[PDB]
Amino acid sequence: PIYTSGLQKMQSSKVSMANVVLSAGSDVIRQAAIKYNVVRTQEIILFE
Amino acid sequence: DIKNVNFQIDITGIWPEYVITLLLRAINNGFNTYVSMPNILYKPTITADVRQFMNTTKAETLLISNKSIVHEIMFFDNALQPKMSSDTLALSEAVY
Amino acid sequence: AKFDVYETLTIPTDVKTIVLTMQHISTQTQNNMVYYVFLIDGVKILAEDIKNVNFQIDITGIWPEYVITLLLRAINNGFNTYVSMPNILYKPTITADVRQFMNTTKAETLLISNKSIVHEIMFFDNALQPKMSSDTLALSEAVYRTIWNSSIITQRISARGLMNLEDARPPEAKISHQSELDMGKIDETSGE
Amino acid sequence: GGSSITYTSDTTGNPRITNARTNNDETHATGPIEDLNSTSHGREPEIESFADRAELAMMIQGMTVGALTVQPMRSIRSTFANLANVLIFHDVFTTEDKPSAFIEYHSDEMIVNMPKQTYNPIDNLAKILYLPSLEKFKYGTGIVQLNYSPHISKLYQNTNNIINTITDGITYANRTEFFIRVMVLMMMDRKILTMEFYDVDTSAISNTAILPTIPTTTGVSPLLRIDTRTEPIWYNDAIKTLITNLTIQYGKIKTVLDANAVKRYSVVGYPIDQYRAYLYNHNLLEYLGKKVKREDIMSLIKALSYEFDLITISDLEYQNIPKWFSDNDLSRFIFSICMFPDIVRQFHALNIDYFSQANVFTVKSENAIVKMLNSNQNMEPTIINWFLFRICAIDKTVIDDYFSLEMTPIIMRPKLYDFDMKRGEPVSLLYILELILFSIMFPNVTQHMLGQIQARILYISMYAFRQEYLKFITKFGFYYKIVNGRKEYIQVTNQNERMTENNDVLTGNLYPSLFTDDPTLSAIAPTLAKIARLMKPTTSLTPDDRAIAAKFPRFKDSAHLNPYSSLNIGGRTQHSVTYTRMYDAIEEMFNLILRAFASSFAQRPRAGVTQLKSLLTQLADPLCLALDGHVYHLYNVMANMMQNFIPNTDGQFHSFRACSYAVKDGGNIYRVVQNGDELNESLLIDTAIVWGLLGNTDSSYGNAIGATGTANVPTKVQPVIPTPDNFITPTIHLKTSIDAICSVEGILLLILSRQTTIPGYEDELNKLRTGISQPKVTERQYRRARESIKNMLGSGDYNVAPLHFLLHTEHRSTKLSKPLIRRVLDNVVQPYVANLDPAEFENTPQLIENSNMTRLQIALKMLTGDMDDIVKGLILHKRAC
Amino acid sequence: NMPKQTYNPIDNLAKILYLPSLEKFKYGTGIVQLNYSPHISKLYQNTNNIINTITDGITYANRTEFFIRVMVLMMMDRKILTMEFYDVDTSAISNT
Structure with a gap:
């Protein structure tokens, strides 16, 4: 968080109270999932 | 939208699930479509036995095989079809 | 895919428009069997070698039974065909909720009728189709649709969508018309 | 002290991963849509379609009036399922x-x-x-x-x-x-x-x-x-x-x-x-905001798999999932392996897990090599008693350890355990042949044992070749020293101690003889050129891009020595070259031993020698079959794994010069390969394993095609090599372990040894450090500090890089003020030089991930601000104010 | 499955006034559409009751019948509307 037009609220080494906070909502922790399909072309042994 | 092509499978077997489904979808609804596989071993038995002619293998399986197993297929001949009585109404739907 | 509704299917120009009369239906033989074929340009054509034709059928009531099966096979088993019929009356029910897009009527009975049998048809809509999940491998399934509306079918639609794609008006949503929000004054005589 | 390292935490970036062999539902992607571009929701249903069935089966009939309904229909969509599996990614x-x-x-x-x-x-x-x-x-x-x-x-x-x-x-x-x-x-x-x-x-x-x-x-x-x-x-x-x-x-x-x-x-x-x-x-x-380019996932999941496979994955681009990448990966890896040698034990353990999972070799009893040669008593009776005392029992848990020892980064030079040899008789040539086989089967481990093998083979020659031996010594005495491009030979002009094995022969400007050509070597002492030429690997040099495309760590232009070839070239199943190699090896060696008999002892019979020549060849055929037909692919996979990143050879037994990066820590220097007399029984290797193997092996390959089955043949089931599952989770587990311990060490460096940390402030860090009471900290303080912290980041235990020996261990000191990575040519730390070093080090490695660096910055600029409850000076006075 | 609703009013005024509408044109609708109320869908028959013609399904006849009956409904049944009001002050702000 920067000031109104000052440098930065982490340079003056002076504490501030009313800066701005991000918030998310109910569910932002949905774990993710992927899936793969496998099929192989050449086996190890072969040929009649 | 495939119009005039012949896909020539080099060897059967190694095709996951995309291309078998796309090829099946292609030989239907294509215009001049062919899928020529000149490497799969089959063994023919030819009959003219409409009473006792089976339909052993649907093509969805001639594209899934380890390229070294010989299938057997029953061909059906009817070249000597009698020309039925001049009474029956001509048919409306053919055979594929 | 993406069945629009506001869009009416327009016949592309490079298609011969053949009126259907009881003269184009003749027979031929091969291997001593008598099949049914077409006479579109003098040459006998089997019902599957149809390349680019648009069949204009009007009375929709009298076609014995053959041309029914022929027309159906050629809508199937065909490359680029079209069977229009600009005289069928139907009540449309338009909805967008996949769980109740049930609509069961075999096109046979749609075709063999008595020219005034006006009946019901459903109509899906998915123009605002949200992206599928982040798992689906690859949509390798065909969903060929069928009978298309031939005229403006959306007069009782007040608003479509109501989503936002990246916090902006989706390119194809519909707010109401300024007609059905106006509220003029009364006429103090008899309301109106 | 302890010997296993089990330490972890949940502060690193690396994700957590689980698996599921589930394909009958989804039950893994759940949530609400928040925008028509949302990509992480549950699943909604689809249009209710119908049958639309029309097979393609050689004169199927019409069935026309039923189909073509007014509801939309589907495509064909054949059914095979093509090995579907599900990965599940959890953050912390x-x-x-x-x-x-x-x-x-x-x-x-x-x-x-x-x-x-x-x-x-x-x-x-x-x-x-x-x-x-x-x-x-x-x-x-x-x-x-x-x-x-x-x-x-x-x-x-x-x-x-x-x-x-x-x-x-x-x-x-x-x-x-x-x-x-x-x-x-x-x-x-x-x-x-x-x-x-x-x-x-x-x-x-x-x-x-x-x-x-x-x-x-x-x-x-x-x-x-x-x-x-x-x-x-x-x-x-x-x-x-x-x-x-x-x-x-x-x-x-x-x-x-x-x-x-x-x-x-x-x-x-x-x-x-x-x-x-x-x-x-x-x-x-x-x-x-964590992106992962899609094909990187693909390269990963394919790197941990058999190489001949079509792998398909869900197909949106830039999935948000905690990436395992880094800018400084190899840096922290070598900094760890060079100061936590038990981590190589962890590597090795995981590797034998992956290998033994494929049960390539099961063991039968009653070794044939001793069944025969026992009950025919028509040959020289030392072949007895000698083969009779060499064949030790075998339980796969040693087989699958020796085989895995092929790839993991060697860190302590190994010595051979047993060495039996009769001084005069011509039987020792058997031992020569034994180690020739052991070299032609694991070309890697030989690359280090070269020093011992030099003196051993030379001794044996001296008692079985004299003209060749002493002539050879005269000319090509004992050691290469590359002066400036030429190669000067230094000798040992004294039979004081020729059979020593401890002369750091593979690091430093000192090469062993016998090996680099100088084509005048041959045509001077034959049978020795003949020996040497038989041992050089001469297989290949393959790159390993497959890994380097998965953002795994290793240097540029890295390679390996896959010791064996393939069998399937276009579908021909050719003659398995390794067998031809091993066969001419055996045949030449037996020709030599036979000529040896014909010199000293002619009054003795010489039928058993050719008898067991035929036996050995006939017994080595199917072994090498199973070797080049099944293991080859396994070594490719293992060469693309993540543990193995220090290649063990360039092939040619000329100037190899095993890796020489090392961490200098202000005077003290820790090496990676640790030259000098040092080892542990986990690494003292035996040779007789080859005899036992070649004798009583039941290869899962042979009985697969019914080549070495018992009472029946075949089984017709293909040799299994492991699945890309069952290894994502251990591999990531391992990487997160080392990242956590390095993070601990970095946090510790932060507040000790002043002259290392200077991110952007250098002032409140100075304010903090006031309290250590001295610009140098005693050891025990350091040790107790690290233990107190390590018991507050995660769980488990780990050590501080002791050095082993055959019996006792010692706990070297651990200070680590301003660590640096440098290469050490001829046991003299070189200064840094661009364009030769990977140009990445250039300075101390940044051991802490960026994010945590920001969080520590915040902690600082918070509690060094106006909340410092300290002030100086005050004035006593007595006034009624 | 749609994003949850985010409206916690405090004063019961917002509730009484525009909770139901805010429920109707909810987030994530797909179509809001006109339709006949009950009693009209009720007046649709659908079978024939007034025009004795032998017909095949439904064709223009139920439509005519339906028109007649809704017509004769509206011709009858006079009603005059009586409602009840509140006492809203200025709580409904910025909305002319």
């Missing part, structure tokens, strides 16, 4: 709802009985909104003052717990300790804030400071006191005239859905200690 951190700030107001008043409060609201809105604040800055306060919240006053100790110094009361030490612990708190514990809002309309009148949407849980501030009428109207007037320029608000300002991942968040204007606010904002806005 969680949520919470109340702000729970760091710094908070607290008040106190000066009047014991104060005027009563005059505020009777009516609507419950004023109550919920600004009753509490109006209570805090009440009428008749005397001072409202900043202060640490609970949990911080709790983190103050106050007694000493981390710095063992005998002190008098409290002095700078509790302050240092307190700093450390609040720091390590904030470095850990990610959280993201979730709140709840109201529906305020315009009831909050005339106060632009209040937006129409309020968080439920209120806060305290003058901004909420201003509106009403209370303690001096003066005060409200002053606050207002002071702030009428600034940009203050309250409640939700706006909302933007991020594009890197579409999920609505909301910027709100709650009052809270700026540091907690920055922590929340940062560690959230990091969670949403």
Whole structure:
């Protein structure tokens, strides 16, 4: 968080109270999932 | 939208699930479509036995095989079809 | 895919428009069997070698039974065909909720009728189709649709969508018309 | 002390991973859509289609009137399922709802009985909104003052717990300790804030400071006191005239859905200690912006798999998932392996797991090589008794260890265990052949044992070849030294001790003889050129791009020596070259031993020799079959794994010069390969394993095609090699383990050994360090510090790089002030040089991940600010003022 | 499955006034569409009751019948509307 037009609220080494906070909502922790399909072309042994 | 092509499978077997489904979808609804596989071993038995002619293998399986197993297929001949009585109404739907 | 509704299917120009009369239906033989074929340009054509034709059928009531099966096979088993019929009356029910897009009527009975049998048809809509999940491998399934509306079918639609794609008006949503929000004054005589 | 390293934590970036062989449902992607571009929701149904069945089966009939319904239909969609599996990616951190700030107001008043409060609201809105604040800055306060919240006053100790110094009361030490612990708190514990809002309309009148949407849980501030009428109207007037320029608000300002991942968040204007606010904002806005290019996932999942496979994955681009990449991967890896040698034991363990999972070799009893050669008694009776004393029993748990020892990075030069040899008789040539086979089967491990093999083979030759031997010594005495491109030979002009094996022969400008060509070697002492030429690997050199495309760590232009070839070239199943190699080896060697018999002992019979020549060839055929037909692929896979990154050979036994990077730590130097007399029974290897193997092996390959089955053949089931599952989780487990221990060491470096850490401040870090009492710290203090911290980041135990020996271990010192990575040519640390070193090191490796660096920066710039409860000087005086 | 609703009013005024509408045109609708109320869908028959013609399904006849009956409904049944009001002050802000 920067000031109104000052440098930065982490340079003056002076504490501030009313800066701005991000918030998310109910569910932002949905774990993710992927899936793969496998099929192989050449086996190890072969040929009649 | 495939119009005039012949896909020539080099060897059967190694095709996951995309291309078998796309090829099946292609030989239907294509215009001049062919899928020529000149490497799969089959063994023919030819009959003219409409009473006792089976339909052993649907093509969805001639594209899934380890390229070294010989299938057997029953061909059906009817070249000597009698020309039925001049009474029956001509048919409306053919055979594929 | 993406069945629009506001869009009416327009016949592309490079298609011969053949009126259907009881003269184009003749027979031929091969291997001593008598099949049914077409006479579109003098040459006998089997019902599957149809390349680019648009069949204009009007009375929709009298076609014995053959041309029914022929027309159906050629809508199937065909490359680029079209069977229009600009005289069928139907009540449309338009909805967008996949769980109740049930609509069961075999096109046979749609075709063999008595020219005034006006009946019901459903109509899906998915123009605002949200992206599928982040798992689906690859949509390798065909969903060929069928009978298309031939005229403006959306007069009782007040608003479509109501989503936002990246916090902006989706390119194809519909707010109401300024007609059905106006509220003029009364006429103090008899309301109106 | 301990020998296993089991340490972990949940501070690193690396994700957590689980598996599922599930394909009958999804039950793994759940959530609500938030935008028509949302990519992480559950699953919605689809159009209800119908049969649309038309097979393609050689004269199928019409069936025309049924199909073509007015409801949409489907395609064909054949059915094979093509090995489907599911990976599930979990991140680490969680949520919470109340702000729970760091710094908070607290008040106190000066009047014991104060005027009563005059505020009777009516609507419950004023109550919920600004009753509490109006209570805090009440009428008749005397001072409202900043202060640490609970949990911080709790983190103050106050007694000493981390710095063992005998002190008098409290002095700078509790302050240092307190700093450390609040720091390590904030470095850990990610959280993201979730709140709840109201529906305020315009009831909050005339106060632009209040937006129409309020968080439920209120806060305290003058901004909420201003509106009403209370303690001096003066005060409200002053606050207002002071702030009428600034940009203050309250409640939700706006909302933007991020594009890197579409999920609505909301910027709100709650009052809270700026540091907690920055922590929340940062560690959230990091969670949403982690991209992973799609084909990297593919390269990974394919690197851990058999190489001849079509692998398909879900097909949107830039999935948001914690990436395992890094800018400094190999740096931390070599810094770890060079100072935690038990990690190679972990590597090796995982590797034998992967290998033994494929059961390539099972063991039968009654070794044939001793069944025969026992009951025919028509040959020289030393072949007996010698083969009879060499064949030890075998249980696969040693087979699958020797085979895995092929790839893992060797770190201690190995020596051979047993060595039997009759001095005069021509039987020792058998031992020569034994080690020739052991070289042609594992060309890697030989690359180091070269030193011992030199002296051993030379001794044996000396007792079985004399002209060749001493002539050879005369010319090509014992050691290459590459002066400037030429190769000068140094000798040993004394039979004082020729058979030594401890002369660091593979590091430093000192090469063994016998090996590099100098084509004049042959045509000087044959049978020795004949020996040497038989041992050089001469297989191949393959790159391993497959790994390097998965962002795994290793140097540029890395390679390996896959010791064997393939069998399937276009579908021909050719002659398995390795067998031809081994066969001519055996045949030549037996020709030589036969010519040996025909020299000294002619009164003896020579049928058994050719007899067991035929036996050995006939027995080596199917073994090499199984070797080049099944293991080859296994070694490709293992060569693309993550553990193995130090190649073991360039092939040619000419100037190999095994890897020589090493960490210098201010005078002390730790090497990677650790030359000098040092090993541990985990690495003293035997040779007879080849005899036992070649004899009583039941290869899962043979009985697969029915080549070495018992009472039946075949089984026709193909040899299995492991599945890409069952190894993602252990591999990531391993990487996160080493990242965690390096993180601990880095945090420790941060607050000790002043002259290392200078990110951007160098001043409050100096303020912190005041408390260690000296610009040098004693060891025991260091050790106790690291143990106290390590018991506060994760769990488990780990060691500090002791060095083993055959019997005893020693615990070298651990200081690590300003570690540096440099290469060491000829045991003399070189200075850094660009374009030869990977040009990446260039400086101390940044052991801490970027994010945590930011969090530590925040901790600093917070608790070195105005909350430093320290001041100097004061004046005693006596005055009635 | 749609994003949850975010509206916690405090004063019961917002509730009484525009909770139901805000429910109707909810987030994530797909189509809001006109339609006949009950009693009209009720007046649709659908079978024939007034025009004795041998017909095949439904064709223009149920439509005519339906028109007649809704017509004769509206021709009858006079009603005059009586409602009841509140006492809203200025809480409904910024909305002319």
